[PDB]
Each structure stands twice: as structure tokens, then as C-alpha cells.
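Q: A reviewer asked whether we had any structural model of the full assembly, not just the individual parts. We don't, so I'm hoping you can provide one. Inputs are below.
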Amino acid sequence: VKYAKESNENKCCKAFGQDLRVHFKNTHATVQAIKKDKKGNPMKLSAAKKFLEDVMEKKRCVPFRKFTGCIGRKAQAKEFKHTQGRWPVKSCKFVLDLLRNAESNAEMKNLDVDNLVIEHIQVNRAPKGRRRTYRAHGRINPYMSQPCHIEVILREQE
RNA sequence: AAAUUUUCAGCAAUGGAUGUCUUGGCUCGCGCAACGAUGAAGGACGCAGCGAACUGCGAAACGCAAUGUGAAUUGCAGAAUUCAGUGAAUCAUCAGAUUUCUGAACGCAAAUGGCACCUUGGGGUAUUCUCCUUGGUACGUCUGUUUCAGUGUCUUU
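A: Here is a predicted structure for the entire assembly that you could use as a starting point for your response.
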């Protein structure tokens, strides 16, 4: 529902997550790992499934580039030339569920599921959730959720 | 050189400004005189075929009678008759009725459907018994009525 991009289609497919109950800043990190390989090329879908299942096992890890403060330094992030990293599990679930739906949309358009490539994943922030936290002295403080919107667009390579 | 930070643009997000609306407000002017012991205003509790509220109404309960208009109401249901009609309507009008429990509130009361007595008509060893049932019994005050009280002023049998 209003994507950011739009292959003349035929050769491309898309999926949208309207308002998921996950952390925005953690989904932002997963999505930046999925988007490209170690070279500048766009990453294959079979690779990004095989990645996100391994991040749930805590064997591969997600590098946190943008939102750093204060994430503990792990050896698995040497993979990305970057000291900080982390295994955001619930974030990997919703992104796997979206790519699962994005491959399902490709199966109607009849193209190779084996040759698919991630053209464009993006996370937007979503409207906030309201809750109450009670402070000493009778003060009341907001506690708030940050759900996010996830676009995915795929296509064939060659 | 990536990454990060900052800047500029494009697309997306977040947010509800600007613009255009408006059965509402505000102000001025002009008419009218109509609450209540024949129970007012206000309160409480109910009532719709399927409603919580808001409007309406009171066990006749989003209404009944009458009159006018003359075919709907509507979210769904049903009713179809109500269709050249002594008649559809969340219609208009409104002169006839209903109008629970309250409240000035009135038998005593009251965080109580509490506690009395009189009374009508009927229901079950009885004039005194219990029961259902109809309507009563507050305060002040005027005119009249009836019954009284006072070695108040007088006659007197």
C-alpha cells in the first residue's frame, strides 16, 4: 500500500507488512544485513532465508551500524568488519514471514523462485502505542510501542 | 574506500497546519404574556419485535383517542391490506384520556417499598380474627355548621 519504488513488473513482485508489533530499531538492523552481499550486488533470496534462520540459532549475527548505543561486542560480527552485533529473533521472524509471502506472490506470476533477488527492503516507523508507567511521587509516565511498516520488492536476475 | 555523522533533492512514513465548506454560535431589532395542593420545576425507576446513550413516553409506557394530510416506515425483520380507503406515517395538528415511585410533598417516617389507624367492596368457628381490595388521615387560615368549656357580664327557674 504505497511502496517507495515500483522493472515494469512482469519480472518483479512485492509484499507489505502494515503495522507489525516489533521494535523499529532492531528490524532496521536486520534489513540492512539482508539487502546486499559483501560485494555491492543485491542479495539472493535463498541466501537471506539461510541467513535469517541462522540468526535465530545465534550462529550468524546482525551488525548494528546505525543504532549502536550500547550494544555488546561479539566475535561473529567480524564477518562484517564491524565490532558490535546482536541476534534480534522476533525481528527475524516477521521479516522471514514477509519474504515467505513475497515468494508466494512470485509463484502466481510463474517465474523462477530459485533465481530471485532482493531489489529493495525498507522499514518505516509506524504510529505509536500508548501505555502507563508509574513513577515515584505519584508521577505517571508514558510507555510506548514503536510498530513498523516493512516493504519488500523482489525480481528475477537474468 | 566502505560504515557512521551532517547537508541538499526525489519517493515513502509520521503529523493534522493551510485552503474550501457549515442544520452551530454571537449581536441587534420586533412581537406575545402562559408554571404550581385540579400536585409545579427538579429527581428516581421503568417502557421499543431486535437499544446502551440522546430525544420521546408512563403498567394505556419511542405511545392511545380526535382532527387534517392521503400512502408509507426502513439498519434488518416482519405486518403485507392499510390500498377509488370510515385509511399507511419516527407525518402534521392536538381541544379527549392515561399519567408508576417521588418532590412545596401532605398519616408517622426514611441509607427502611419500614411502622400505624379509619374506610369501601369482596374472600375465608366470630361483634372483637386474619386476608385481599377502594379511597382516605400534614400545617396555617377565612365563612358557615355542630358539639362543648369558663363563680367572664346578666337575669332567673
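A: Points you may want to mention in the reply: Chain A is about 30% helix and 30% strand. Residues 2-6, 63, 65-66, 68, 80-82, 122, 124-128, 148-149, 151 of chain A lie near RNA strand B (CB under 10 Å from a C1').
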